[PDB]
Subunit: 219 residues, 4 copies
């Protein structure tokens, strides 16, 4: 109590609802300030900011389409402008094969996955600037039949592995979390939240590269 500690800062993409919101709650409750990104309207966001604020966090919502690469820098900058630092990124993602259309592959692999890879780059750059050099994390939420989804998921898994190795010397740990089936018995968003809050809280600094199953063992 002599010395005041910063609330570390977490970006939770798609943190407005579902697993994302389960994650923002757990992080808020465990001492993080929160920046949520999404395309959702103001009325959707308002009670989430109010609730999360209740748990003692300062919370912002950034309305931006992460699929669009030209929105990344502005989004990163709006976070740094609010809090002056970034400690944790949570990349929270959200059929017969003969029917598969290139449109679907383009959307899911060409656009969505690309958006995650490059937002991560934009966030990473701001993290690597700071130099405070505390314990930071990049946590990628994937899951576990649409082959393009399988491919995206696999890509992100290799992304996390590769990133973890590249960042091994830096104090930024990289993790993958694979949620199973979650209701809105079965898993709750609080269960994923708890896992993400555990990984973000610093105790796993030496566990970079790890893959956490999050399906209550059902596999």
């Amino acid at each position: 109590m002599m010395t005041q500690k910063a609330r570390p800062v977490a970006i939770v993409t798609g943190g407005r609802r579902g697993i994302g919101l389960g994650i923002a709650r757990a992080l808020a409750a465990s001492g993080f300030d929160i920046a949520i990104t999404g395309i959702g309207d103001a009325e959707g966001v308002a009670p989430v900011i109010a609730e999360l604020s209740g748990l003692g966090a300062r919370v912002i919502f950034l309305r931006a389409d992460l699929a669009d690469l030209s929105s990344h820098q502005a989004t990163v900058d709006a976070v740094v402008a609010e809090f002056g630092r970034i400690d944790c990124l949570v990349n929270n993602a959200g059929d017969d094969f003969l029917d598969l259309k290139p449109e679907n592959f383009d959307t899911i692999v060409g656009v969505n996955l690309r958006g995650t890879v490059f937002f991560t780059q934009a966030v990473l750059k701001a993290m690597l600037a700071s130099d405070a050099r505390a314990s930071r994390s990049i946590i990628n939420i994937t899951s576990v039949e649409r082959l393009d989804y399988c491919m995206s998921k696999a890509g992100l898994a290799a992304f996390s592995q590769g990133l973890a190795l590249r960042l091994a010397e830096t104090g930024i740990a990289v993790f993958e979390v694979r949620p199973g089936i979650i209701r809105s018995r079965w898993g709750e968003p609080e269960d994923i939240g708890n896992i993400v809050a555990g990984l973000a809280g610093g105790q796993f600094g030496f566990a970079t590269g790890s893959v956490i199953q999050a399906d209550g063992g059902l596999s």
Copy 2:
């Protein structure tokens, strides 16, 4: 006594290097060969001739498989020549510096090419209806650039998912991961042997298998 058809293989990029290795091994073991590529009249002639000598009927098809609209003509050409397809062989930096264009090229476009060319061949395999033993053999590899790692993981996930979806047809799906090859190393002949082996029929029941092909250096 019943005459069996020489089974038909499409070896993509079969003109040089590893593809040629595979194309030879399959020829030598009773396959007719269709090779795809981009190269001029010159780079084609003694290859068709060498493979003809080994006992095969051989056609070359000029195709940039990255271009999706060229798929249907390519398949149609193979079907028009032999009347059936038995085997598809799908053959062939610091993160802060990674560029969206890089991703577009490798994940965005080349992986997409492989997936949808596979889809086109699949449709033609399935229509013929003989229902005999067919194979799709995906050739991959084993600090690298994170977009190649992602496409490689995409491809691997694609093999697994096809295997499962094709499990009740006579089409087996395999993944071959070659190590290091020549221009105590590995030959293109070595890869060929594995592929000839997998395509020869003895592996019908081994669908979903990943074959390491580095003479055990990966361990």
Copy 3:
């Protein structure tokens, strides 16, 4: 607002030195009482006991050779007698070219030491299941991440972890595997592994049973 309860109990096998002590320290600091087992004489453990007490923990040491199956029940009973509960088990335990490998060796490692971990866990699990509020509990197996018998035993332990996790998924008992890299007596510290185990043991990871945690600072 903030609610403090009685302390859960952790058994840390081999918790007297090295990785085990780093684990016990972190468990103590994170709110657990501790039972340390060791094959060795109870001599020289007093400092550790006094240290972990400085971290708020009641701590006992129990002499036990876990390879000896007949010693299991007594050890488990002694922990229950001291604390009235067990919430966390931390299984923390321990050269040739293959043509020269000997049956005696395979037996020692595979034959006994791995048999030890398996059945000791079985004995703890009975004690855990005999009083369960289906409460938040965990079993954490510490392995590693070249000689063939150790590799096999590693593999066995990984398989054990998976299977036990599946089997225990109905209960509140999560099972994890933690694969340390090389650690100091660069490399990591026993504290890096302790933090991970303390993390797994704290409750936040109940839905994550069956997870394998890399604990080598991502160098593999």
Copy 4:
């Protein structure tokens, strides 16, 4: 006629083991079959595989009994002069009720049996020195904890041997059956691997369940 490569098929008397011996005989191998039981029902099998071109012998041996190993290898070398292929096929409910005796039998003795039989065969393989393509093929499976442990031990043994034997010409594969499968289906895979075309794929694991590995 050319010389015939020689394969040891442990548990080759019936089931999957017979499917492998049948298929290796047809691809040009002579065969030695190993079995815990008496040699009674064997004659038919010996007759069938001769039809396929193969000289075949049956060796009664309990591979769980290490002291029987040397004699078995010696018997195969005595008959045939060489050993080109070892197929490890011989093998055999609530954890709260698991008994140390059960563990000992499956893990501490039977898995031990395979590991050490392989050691003995490999000693014979490495003395021959012929060092053309050779193979050791470990047959496993695609719920009782000790079995899973045994199988995982075997997967890992498989991988280590593969790496240790990398520079030698002896390749090491694991095959994982799940049987609507037939012993022929497994036999073909094994004949493919024992056949040479996979020398550079040592260490590879083969799935053998017709793709019910993520299906049912």
